Design a protein around this ligand. Structure first.
Ligand SMILES: Cc1cc2nc3c(=O)[nH]c(=O)nc-3n(C[C@H](O)[C@H](O)[C@H](O)COP(=O)(O)O)c2cc1C
Ligand code: SF4
Ligand code: FES
Lengths: 431, 213, 87
């Protein structure tokens, strides 16, 4: 069995047009292997397609990491009279995360083909793609690719000459991070405020327009055709156990070369920064902390970044999570309190306001953290702030409440001395 | 930043608004994207369309979309106020939107913000006296690795320095349309200094396909 | 919404005249039973008390809220009118 992960070869990379150095339109994508033998895949049936996703070990790439094959099989049932839909989550709102953008604008035909194959596995009649409204130029690229697929018979009536009917629709957001939440996305497509629904019912029973629905991330949908062509076993030969496959990474912050790159799951975080991002600005020893999977994940200090792997289970044991695998690097000259406070301000601006612990609690944590930045607090407030975040976490309708509590807890967990020190500075300045 | 409406001479229910004949055909295609009996799903795309025609949404524009889709006006008012991309007050010809969230803040988006204010003379949230520009901070725009970045209308201008953004304002003042994308030495999201991946020629159709199709 | 004041039976007497005190305008009464309210576990206990004291009485049957069928999922109906236009 494999033991060390990384050094992904170019022949085993899925998004082979990540940087846009090749023609993104149909002609280029087909020449790179997209849309190949899709008819053969469709005619093998939904049970076969769902089997390959299950074996591949694929897990949701939107932030929660649920096993994709098991989740998609929820819709593998007979029709009860209603249409069935696939909703592709291209909202791409989590701060630090910009991977889904490159797929839409440079690899659009993998997303369109993934919609058809993934849509077949679920028995869905059409796919609605929800792309955030700020991605106007990327939404326009996606529409052009969709028209090309329609004009070649790949999607629509008798898709790929398969006897299966499939429409791909693009619907644009209007500026709301919460609409990336799976049920808040559905409510937005239906024309309401982007406010999450409680569960149950689950989307696979009552979804968009009250119909069976699956919400899947762009990267999750855009790798299924390759998983079917090359086999789930090939995909399962990467990463650790229950952390299979290749993964797109965004390295931003205080690195020499911020970039988006594909890499193997379970790659060491140190290796990913050094090999692809050109190292931490000022040398590895200048590293202060890393937010490894988007603003929703807790930060981790340099002493934990030395050996930590980049996968769902390795980061969970480091008291964080892989999330969207968006690495934000903070070197030793960062004001760590201010950086986290700016994240709580973001969550304050993004809360939908529906439910009490987030509508009131997140705003409350924002005010406390603004004072913590200046030191205008007492040390006893640190434990109060921890307890407040625990009242938000696990008590809200959606996970945005959890995603606002975790970054606060990560800060207090690893940088309490910096919090207490700053309060002591403020107290002496005003004595 | 007020979520109640008070009628004014330039913003009241009698304020003239209607879609162009061309925009009524676009609305028809928007409505057909959704199941019959759920035309309310078209509220977001149709309000956005009215904003593109008019530049902002007067209360009469919201009242018009409500009528065309047979939706209560209040339910249209809820969508307009909820989503931040809808402009309920007029904005300048160029709506500059600087990202200030942490990944961009770490790459000194403060300098970009300061440069725009210094060049235009305005503050965040204000419109220039000639009504050409409007300036606001926004949350993450999904271009984090290309920070610091701004969005002016539908275009992203990325990897900015104070000099770069100042030039972009100059090009806009002259009526020109600056090229979007990074203003640094790269094209999109690739590492600066040469690619660390995807340097082989991509494998063509059929590569690595399991037997049995 | 609390229901904790609808558990026990009560006995009250008919309301009689109240008039305004000429000096101060306070509410005067000549009814010694104006404030008399008695609590009972059951209707039978209240009726037994009223009989032995010789009071004519009226019994009103208890009103229990009818059971309801609640479905959150009904808010998002595909084809029924229960689909809500806002949340
Ligand atoms: C506040 C919030 C924002 C989210 N934004 C996104 C997003 O932008 N893109 C995404 O794929 N998932 C997002 N999610 C996660 C989705 O709710 C959901 O888990 C995901 O789309 C499921 O797809 P997957 O199984 O392929 O990951 C968000 C969740 C929350 C709570
Ligand atoms: S947790 Fe926040 S964003 Fe989620 S439903 Fe509650 S108020 Fe809305
Ligand atoms: S933090 Fe600015 S684009 Fe993401």
């Amino acid at each position: 069995k494999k033991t060390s992960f990384g050094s992904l070869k170019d022949e085993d990379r899925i998004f082979t047009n990540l940087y846009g150095r090749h023609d993104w339109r149909l002609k280029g994508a087909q020449s790179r292997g997209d849309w190949y033998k899709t008819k053969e895949i469709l005619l093998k049936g939904p049970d076969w397609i769902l089997g390959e996703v299950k074996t591949s070990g694929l897990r949701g790439r939107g932030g929660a990491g649920f096993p994709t094959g098991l989740k998609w099989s929820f819709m593998n049932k007979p029709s009860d009279g209603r249409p069935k839909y696939l909703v592709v989550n291209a909202d791409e709102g989590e701060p630090g995360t910009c991977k889904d953008r490159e797929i839409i604008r440079h690899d659009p035909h993998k997303l369109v083909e993934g919609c058809l194959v993934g849509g077949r596995a679920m028995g869905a009649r059409a796919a609605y793609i929800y792309i955030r409204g700020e991605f106007y130029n990327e939404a326009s690229n996606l529409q052009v690719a969709i028209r090309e697929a329609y004009e070649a018979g790949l999607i629509g009536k008798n898709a790929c000459g398969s006897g299966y009917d499939f429409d791909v629709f693009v619907v644009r957001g209007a500026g709301a991070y919460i609409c990336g939440e799976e049920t808040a996305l559905i409510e937005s497509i239906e024309g309401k405020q982007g406010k999450p629904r409680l569960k149950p019912p689950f989307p696979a029973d009552v979804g968009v327009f009250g119909c069976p629905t699956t919400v899947a991330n762009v990267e999750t949908v855009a790798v299924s055709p390759t998983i079917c062509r090359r086999g789930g076993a090939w995909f399962a030969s990467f990463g650790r156990e229950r952390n299979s496959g290749t993964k797109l990474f965004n390295i931003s912050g205080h690195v020499n070369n911020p970039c988006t790159v594909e890499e193997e799951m379970s790659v060491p975080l140190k290796e990913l920064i050094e090999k692809h991002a050109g190292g931490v600005t000022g040398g590895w020893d200048n590293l202060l902390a890393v937010i490894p999977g988007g603003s929703s994940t807790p930060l981790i200090p340099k002493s934990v970044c030395e050996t930590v792997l980049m996968d769902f289970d390795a980061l969970i044991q480091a008291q964080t999570g892989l999330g969207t695998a968006a690495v934000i690097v903070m070197d030793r000259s960062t004001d760590i309190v201010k950086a986290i406070a700016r994240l709580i301000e973001f969550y304050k601006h993004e809360s939908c306001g529906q439910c009490t612990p987030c509508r009131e609690g997140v705003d409350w944590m924002n005010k406390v953290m603004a004072r913590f930045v200046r030191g205008d607090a007492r040390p006893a407030e640190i434990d109060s702030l921890w307890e407040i975040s625990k009242q938000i976490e696990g008590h809200t309708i959606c996970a945005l409440g959890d995603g606002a509590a975790w970054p606060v807890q990560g800060l207090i967990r690893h940088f309490r001395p910096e919090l207490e020190e700053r309060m002591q500075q403020f107290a002496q300045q005003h004595q | 930043a007020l979520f109640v409406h008070r009628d004014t001479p330039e913003n009241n229910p009698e304020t003239p608004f209607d879609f162009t004949p061309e925009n009524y055909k676009r609305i028809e295609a928007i409505v057909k994207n959704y199941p019959e009996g759920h035309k309310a799903a078209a509220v977001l795309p149709v309000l956005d369309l009215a904003q593109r025609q008019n530049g902002w949404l007067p209360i009469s524009a919201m009242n018009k979309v409500a009528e065309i889709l047979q939706v209560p006006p209040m339910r249209v008012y809820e969508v307009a106020t909820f989503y931040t991309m809808y402009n309920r007050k007029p904005v300048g010809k160029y709506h500059i939107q600087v990202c200030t969230t942490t990944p961009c803040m770490l790459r000194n988006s403060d300098s970009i913000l300061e440069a725009i204010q210094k060049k235009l003379g305005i503050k965040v949230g204000e419109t220039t006296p000639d009504k050409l520009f409007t300036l606001i901070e926004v949350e993450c725009l999904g271009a984090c690795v290309n920070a610091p970045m701004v969005q002016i209308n539908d275009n992203y201008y990325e990897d900015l320095t104070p000099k770069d953004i100042e030039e972009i304002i100059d090009e806009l003042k002259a009526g020109k349309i600056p090229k979007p994308g990074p203003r640094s030495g790269r094209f999109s999201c690739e590492p600066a200094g040469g690619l660390t991946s995807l340097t082989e020629p991509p494998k063509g159709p059929g590569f690595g396909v399991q037997a049995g199709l | 919404s609390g229901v904790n004041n609808t558990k026990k039976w009560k006995m009250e007497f008919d309301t009689r005249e109240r008039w305004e005190n000429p000096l101060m305008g306070w509410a005067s009464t000549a009814d010694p039973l104006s404030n008399l309210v008695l609590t009972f576990s059951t209707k039978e206990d209240a009726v037994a008390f009223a009989e032995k004291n010789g009071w004519s009485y009226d019994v009103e049957e208890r009103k229990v809220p009818k059971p309801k069928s609640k479905s959150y999922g009904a808010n998002f109906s595909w084809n029924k009118r229960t689909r809500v236009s806002t949340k």
